[PDB]
Amino acid sequence: SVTGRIVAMASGAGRPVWGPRDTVSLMRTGFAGNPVGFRSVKLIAEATAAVPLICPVLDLLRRPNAGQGRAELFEALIGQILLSGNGYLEAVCPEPGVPRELHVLRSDRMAVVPGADGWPVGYDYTVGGRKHRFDMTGHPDPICHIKSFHPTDDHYGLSPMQAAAVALDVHNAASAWSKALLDNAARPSGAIIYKGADGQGVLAPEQYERLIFEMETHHQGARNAGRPMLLEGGLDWKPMGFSPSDMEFHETKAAAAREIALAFGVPPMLIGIPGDATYANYAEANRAFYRLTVLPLLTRVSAALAWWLSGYLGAQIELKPDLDQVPALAVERDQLWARIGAAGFLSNSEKRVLLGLPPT
Amino acid sequence: SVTGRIVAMASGAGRPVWGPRDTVSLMRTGFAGNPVGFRSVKLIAEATAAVPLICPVLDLLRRPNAGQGRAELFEALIGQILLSGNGYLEAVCPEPGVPRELHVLRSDRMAVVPGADGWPVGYDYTVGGRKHRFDMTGHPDPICHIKSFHPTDDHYGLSPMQAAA
Amino acid sequence: TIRGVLRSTASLRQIASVVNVEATSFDVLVDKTDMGSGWASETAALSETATPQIDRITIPLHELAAMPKASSAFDIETWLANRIADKFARAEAAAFISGDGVDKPTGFLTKTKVANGAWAWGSLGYVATGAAGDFAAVNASDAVVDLVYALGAEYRANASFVMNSKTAGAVRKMKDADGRFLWADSLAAGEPARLMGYPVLIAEDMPDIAANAYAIAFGDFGNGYTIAERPDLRVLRDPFSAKPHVLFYASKRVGGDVSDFAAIKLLKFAA
Amino acid sequence: GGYLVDPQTSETIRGVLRSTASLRQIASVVNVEATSFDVLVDKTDMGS
């Protein structure tokens, strides 16, 4: 408010503020690059789309636009929040109330404008060199801007991939270590050293094709494994080894594959990375997933759709996750129905009102 | 459909398309060669024959031909699908309805013909240098061609042995 | 945050007619003369009084290009994009005022000026001040006021002055015989921004006061000067050519000359 | 008045029409990805 008016004129009013430089490069190296960063976002964005909502307005959410369904919208929406900390939703309003179009604008090509009083007046969709300049100097405010929490910045989110940006580059390069080691490596299974009478001496190409053909036919392969291999004077066979055989950055990749899953908040058991057994039997780790990183994330976006879309309506609407018939929370529902169902002292209608039932 | 008509004339209409080269050599080295590849097909092909079916027509399936029983048919049928991704069943119809012969044609010696509109018109059983040219330009279509899923090819299956080669 | 020198921003863009054009050029169509209708006689032939000869003036819609090589404290992509947009906003300002014909918009100063009172269509009109060095010594600002009142009452509905900073300096240096600052009287006033009831545009690409220079312009540039342009800015985020330097490619295309030769009047500091 | 009026152009940039028969129609093409292709023919037959 009053502090915001002072903050604007420091950065510059009326001019675009970009924020993160590398957020276009963390997507290609951290979401199209490694499977752990890929699966972690896909595990969350496909979970928030599956959660039903509680309110008309949801008829817009069920069918926002052509080729982009209800579940496909939140996968695009949360998939921008997990990737770049910012969610955007353009609304096209031919009609005054409940605009019949929603569009997830990607957050690579969007930039904020601080405006006069510190709270934003412009958003700039910049593809190529071409802009749009959406306007926020009105009441319906055609873009909801969902921020992840950022303590240092005043206009953007923190994007958990930015917090895991070291552990992505460890996991990307340790996995590419073993790829290029299997592709650039010369191990021999031995070496036939031929010194000669001198300290140095080549063998003639007559003798050399004799040496290949007795090696090609009689010594290499599975079927020639272990021939006794007569060595006359001058010749000698030094068998080479391969001293680091397995495990090239095997644990530092597996520790970095856990820190990527740590930052987005998925448990190691759901994604499939190896590791020590923290959660027990998937009734917990799936319940932990829909309680520490999905439903807090989904109740934060739905609280912004409940306020941005109510600016198009007259009456304000609440919009919250269901927190009921979501089958990962069944262990919190067994535990609460068997507690009150076994409490026989209080009567029948006195516990339908506790469990959420329509009373009789 | 419409895309298929264009696809045909690229490969060549009226001419046989063979597909996999090595499928005759993966059988000797992967099904007669190692016990793990041998038992894996025998474990599945003897399981699909044991499963009953729900429908007359099953009277054909119970006794397809001489020396080749109901359970022996699906062992031959699935044993070609697991080995070479393709299943074939010739039907001999002296009678118009429910033809009283079924024969698992091996998929080493069978080749497809794309035909005009991309969907097949000919199948060619080639043993030695001798052909047969089964015809698909009719309604009963005397060979069922069971494909395993192949994303890159338009006429054959993927044959899990090729993936484990 | 990386800083830069803060350059002048006022650019004649906000007072001239900005037309979004998509083709290669923009053709404005102005008639050069009048209908020439006369009062008819009661017994006369009365035929073919006259017809205005029209003229197409072509806005060539040139292009502007600047090509810097890029060669984590501050982020270059946003900063260089905030510098090259400023340079494209400032380098077209010089072309709008004193640009020549070759590959760039021809500014309104380069249009073969003719002294007002002998004004024809193909030129711009000026009024002389007096002595060649500066304003007239006996009566200053008489050149300013008859520059205003030698234009035409239809264009003076929304007309503006165009100067640079140190010509508005020499205007505010004008004083009466007691030295009381004809424009913005006290030392506590500031820029009054309403010279002769009309706005002032401080455009630094105007020349300063010299022996013959046209340092003060006045006009309805909405009819006078037509800026035809394409609104976008090309952004080639180039990852090739040089591995060492990104060498971003940014271009905006823009054109413009005068559409109406009657709107703009100049002040020649000569006799 | 001659500057006032401007001509109407065609809807498509059109070209001189040249033939399409190319012997690609009658020869046999192969969908191949390589740097070379090696046909395998039999110059002579076995003695019988």
Strand boundaries in chain A, DSSP class E: 53-54, 86-92, 101-104, 110-113, 122-125, 134-135, 143-147, 191-194, 235-238, 320-321
Inter-chain residue contact C77 with A15, CB threshold 8 Å = no
Chain B residues touching D31 at Cβ < 8 A: 10-11
Burial class (CB in 10 A: 0-12, 13-18, 19+), C40: exposed
Inter-chain residue contact D1 with C56, CB threshold 8 Å = no
Chain D residues touching B10 at Cβ < 8 A: 29, 31
Q: What angle do CA A66, A67, A72 make, to 5 degrees?
A: 120
Quick one: tokens of B66?
């001489």
**DSSP type of residue D47:** P
Contact B138, B129 (CB under 8 A): no
Shortest CA distance from D4: residue in chain C? C29
Q: How far apart are CA C150 and CA C265, in angstroms?
A: 8
Contact C36, C50 (CB under 8 A): yes
Q: What dihedral angle (degrees, nearest 10) is formed by the CA atoms of C86, C90, C95, C96?
A: 100
Q: How far apart are CA A110 and CA A16, in angstroms?
A: 10
Residue of C72, C250, C251 lying closest to A21 (CB–CB): C72
Inter-chain residue contact C29 with D4, CB threshold 8 Å = yes
Instruction: Return the number of other C-beta atoms located less than 10 Å from residue C13's C-beta.
Output: 17
Contacts of A238 (CB under 8 A, 6+ apart): A190, A191, A193
Beta bridge partners of A87: A146
Which has the closest alpha carbon to A141: A16, A297, A304, A315? A304
Q: Helix %, strand %, coil % for chain B, to 5?
A: 35, 20, 45
Q: Please report where in the chains the tokens 């006021």 appear, as a residue.
A: C145
The whole-angstrom distance between D9's CA and the closest CA on chain C is 14
Q: How far apart are CA C133 and CA C135, in angstroms?
A: 7
Return residues 3-22 of D near C (CB < 8 Å).
3-4
Contact B89, B102 (CB under 8 A): yes
Quick one: tokens of B145?
């061609």
Instruction: Compute and round to an integer the Cα radius of gyration of chain B.
Output: 17
Chains C and D touch (3+ CB pairs under 8 A): yes
Q: How far apart are CA D48 and CA D46, in angstroms?
A: 6
The whole-angstrom distance between B11's CA and the closest CA on chain D is 7
Residue of A20, A22, A130 lying closest to C232 (CB–CB): A130
Instruction: Return the number of other C-beta atoms located less than 10 Å from residue A211's C-beta.
Output: 14
Contact C146, C266 (CB under 8 A): no
Beta bridge partners of C63: C253
Q: Please report where in the chains the tokens 């199948």 appear, as a residue.
A: B123
The whole-angstrom distance between D14's CA and the closest CA on chain B is 26
Chains B and D touch (3+ CB pairs under 8 A): yes
If you count residue pairs, one on A and one on C, with CB atoms under 8 Å apart, how many are there?
31
Q: How far apart are CA C1 and CA A11, in angstroms?
A: 9
Return residues 1-48 of D near B (CB < 8 Å).
28-29, 31
Shortest CA distance from C32: residue in chain D? D1
Dmax (CA) for chain A in angstroms is 108
If you count residue pairs, one on B and one on D, with CB atoms under 8 Å apart, how many are there?
6
Q: How far apart are CA A178 and CA A145, in angstroms?
A: 42
Q: Identify the residue among D31, D42, D46 best suited for mutation to test binding to B, counting B beta carbons within 10 A and taking the highest.
A: D31
Contact A120, A113 (CB under 8 A): yes
Q: How far apart are CA A159 and CA C113, in angstroms?
A: 61
The whole-angstrom distance between A155's CA and the closest CA on chain C is 15
Question: Which subunits sit against D, judged by 3+ Cβ pairs under 8 A?
Answer: B, C
Chain C residues touching A126 at Cβ < 8 A: 235
Q: How far apart are CA C129 and CA C115, in angstroms?
A: 12
Chains A and B touch (3+ CB pairs under 8 A): no
Helix (H/G/I), strand (E/B), else coil: A53: strand
Q: Identify the residue among C64, C79, C82, C252 best suited for mutation to test binding to A, counting A beta carbons within 10 A and taking the highest.
A: C82
Q: What angle do CA A172, A173, A174 make, to 5 degrees?
A: 100
Shortest CA distance from D2: residue in chain C? C54
Q: How far apart are CA A49 and CA C215, in angstroms?
A: 66
CA–CA distance from A327 to each of A285, A293, A296, C64 (Å)? Answer: 13, 16, 17, 61
Q: Identify the residue among D22, D24, D25, D29 best suited for mutation to test binding to B, counting B beta carbons within 10 A and taking the highest.
A: D29
Inter-chain residue contact D28 with B11, CB threshold 8 Å = no
What is the enclosing helix (H) or strand (E) of B104?
strand B101-104
Q: How far apart are CA C247 and CA B114, in angstroms?
A: 52
Quick one: tokens of A110?
């969007």
- Packing angle of the helix pair A35-48, A295-308 (nearest 10 deg): 50
The whole-angstrom distance between A129's CA and the closest CA on chain C is 4
Instruction: Return the number of other C-beta atoms located less than 10 Å from residue A330's C-beta.
Output: 13
Q: Please report where in the chains the tokens 């506590």 appear, as a residue.
A: C188
The whole-angstrom distance between D30's CA and the closest CA on chain B is 7
Inter-chain residue contact D28 with B12, CB threshold 8 Å = yes
Contacts of A173 (CB under 8 A, 6+ apart): none
Return residues 40-69 of B near D (CB < 8 Å).
none
Contact C72, A21 (CB under 8 A): yes
From the centroid of its chain, how far is CA B74? 12
Burial class (CB in 10 A: 0-12, 13-18, 19+), A221: exposed
Chain D residues touching C29 at Cβ < 8 A: 3-4
Helix (H/G/I), strand (E/B), else coil: A192: strand
Q: How far apart are CA B125 and CA B106, in angstroms?
A: 9
Chain A residues touching C232 at Cβ < 8 A: 128-131
Sign, CA dihedral B139-B143-B144-B148, equals negative
Which has the closest alpha carbon to A270: A253, A294, A250? A294
Q: Please report where in the chains the tokens 């970009």 appear, as a residue.
A: A18
From the centroid of its chain, how far is CA A109? 19
Chain C residues touching D1 at Cβ < 8 A: 54
Beta bridge partners of C62: C254
Instruction: Compute and round to an integer the Cα radius of gyration of chain A.
Output: 31
Instruction: Compute and round to an integer the Cα radius of gyration of chain D.
Output: 27
Chain D residues touching C27 at Cβ < 8 A: 3
- Provide the residue type at A195 as one letter: K
Helix (H/G/I), strand (E/B), else coil: B70: helix
Q: What angle do CA A85, A91, A95 make, to 5 degrees?
A: 165
A22 vs C: CB within 8 A: yes
Per-residue b or e along C69-100, where b marks 16 or more CB atoms closer than 10 Å to that residue's CB: eeeeeebbbbbbbbebbeebbbbbbbbbbbbe
The whole-angstrom distance between B72's CA and the closest CA on chain D is 39
Contact A84, A159 (CB under 8 A): yes
Residue ranges of chain C whose CB lies within 8 Å of a chain D CB: 27, 29, 54-56
Q: How far apart are CA B110 and CA B18, in angstroms?
A: 8
Contact B83, B27 (CB under 8 A): yes
Sign, CA dihedral A98-A99-A102-A103, equals negative
Q: How far apart are CA A27 and CA A66, in angstroms?
A: 26
Return residues 117-156 of B near D (CB < 8 Å).
none
What is the strand order of the sheet A134-135 is part of? A110-113, A122-125, A134-135
Contact B114, B17 (CB under 8 A): yes
Q: Please report where in the chains the tokens 């093409």 appear, as a residue.
A: D29
Q: Helix %, strand %, coil % for chain D, to 5?
A: 0, 0, 100
Q: How far apart are CA A118 and CA A154, in angstroms?
A: 9
- A23-28 CB contacts, 8 Å cutoff, 24+ apart: A23/A83, A23/A84, A23/A107, A23/A108, A23/A159, A23/A162, A24/A108, A26/A83, A26/A159, A26/A161, A26/A162, A26/A165, A26/A168, A27/A83, A27/A84, A27/A108
Instruction: Compute and round to an integer the Cα radius of gyration of chain C.
Output: 23
Q: What dihedral angle (degrees, nearest 10) is formed by the CA atoms of C261, C266, C268, C269?
A: -170
Chain C residues touching A129 at Cβ < 8 A: 232-235, 250-252
The whole-angstrom distance between D18's CA and the closest CA on chain B is 22
Which has the closest alpha carbon to C77: C242, C238, C270, C265? C238
Write the Ramachandran bin of C32: left for phi over 0, alpha for psi from -120 to 50, otherwise beta. alpha
What is the strand order of the sheet B122-125 is part of? B110-113, B122-125, B134-135
Contact A155, A322 (CB under 8 A): no
Instruction: Return the number of other C-beta atoms located less than 10 Å from residue B14's C-beta.
Output: 11
Chains C and B touch (3+ CB pairs under 8 A): no
If you count residue pairs, one on C and one on D, with CB atoms under 8 Å apart, how many are there?
8
- Provide the residue type at C235 as one letter: V
Inter-chain residue contact B10 with D28, CB threshold 8 Å = no
A18 vs C: CB within 8 A: yes
**DSSP type of residue A127:** B
Inter-chain residue contact C29 with D1, CB threshold 8 Å = no
Chain D residues touching B114 at Cβ < 8 A: none
Shortest CA distance from C57: residue in chain D? D3
Per-residue b or e along A113-140, where b marks 16 or more CB atoms closer than 10 Å to that residue's CB: bbbeebebbbbbbbeebebeebebeeee
Helix (H/G/I), strand (E/B), else coil: B2: helix
Contact C143, C267 (CB under 8 A): yes
The whole-angstrom distance between D1's CA and the closest CA on chain C is 6
Q: How far apart are CA B70 and CA B111, in angstroms?
A: 26
Chain C residues touching A128 at Cβ < 8 A: 232, 234-235
- B41-46 CB contacts, 8 Å cutoff, 24+ apart: B41/B79, B41/B82, B41/B83, B44/B78, B44/B82, B45/B74, B45/B75, B45/B78, B45/B79, B45/B82, B46/B75
Q: How far apart are CA A6 and CA A13, in angstroms?
A: 11
The whole-angstrom distance between C222's CA and the closest CA on chain D is 22
> Please, what is the end-to-end C-alpha distance for chain A in angstroms?
50
Inter-chain residue contact C82 with A15, CB threshold 8 Å = yes
Sign, CA dihedral A284-A286-A289-A294, equals negative
Q: Please report where in the chains the tokens 């699908």 appear, as a residue.
A: B81
Q: Which three-class secondary structure string do you get for chain C? A: CCCCCCCCCCCCCCCCEEEECCCCCEEEEEECCCCCCCCCCCCCCCCCCCCCCEEEEEECCEEEEECCCCCCCCCHHHHHHHHHHHHHHHHHHHHHHHCCCCCCCCCCCCCCCEECCCCCCCCCEEEECCCCCCCCCCCCCHHHHHHHCCCCCCHHHCCEEEECHHHHHHHHCCCCCCCCCCCCCCCCCCCCCCHHHCCEEECCCCCCCCCCCEEEEEECHHHHEEEEECCCCEEECCCCCCCCCCCCEEEEEEEEEECCCCCEEEEECCC
